[PDB]
Symmetry: C2
Subunit: 88 residues, 2 copies
């Protein structure tokens, strides 16, 4: 497994660890999202419900994997853009 | 560092390992992309130039981090969707 394939497997791993405690095992409810954020993105965040509403693209009140990975990408892109600029 | 923060750091790590051999150190030329694909996503891919044209959102003939992470997300989402469906 390459470094990049491992990173991709790791995001999927993270998602699956929190999406199975209630409702669909393929999505995050507001409660599951609250736990995923405090455990995986501590300090990033009222806030949890607004986050869910921001990420929910199809209006089912849950965060599925597509919605979640778009969020992970955005955060990662913001980090990379910041050090790119600190760079001069 | 959490599991998810580590995965994000790992994608940034992967990108930086290949974007520094030519031209801007913040982007991938077609040559750098060819090397990144054979080393990090072997077997995924003519093909390299078409891939670059597909990912290049701003028309500079290079893949920057935003373009790259959108690609990583898409591949990861496609993997997760596949096993979600194999699931019944
Ligand atoms: Ca769930
Ligand atoms: Ca949704
Ligand atoms: Ca470069
Ligand atoms: Ca570009």
């Amino acid at each position: 497994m390459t470094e990049l394939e491992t990173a991709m497997g790791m995001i999927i791993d993270v998602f699956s660890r929190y999406s199975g405690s209630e409702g669909s095992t393929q999505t995050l409810t507001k409660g599951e999202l609250k736990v995923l954020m405090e455990k995986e993105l501590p300090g990033f965040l009222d806030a949890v419900d607004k986050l869910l509403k921001d990420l929910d693209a199809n209006g089912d009140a849950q965060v599925d994997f597509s919605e979640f990975i778009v969020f992970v990408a955005a955060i990662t892109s913001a980090c990379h853009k910041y050090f790119e600029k600190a760079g001069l």
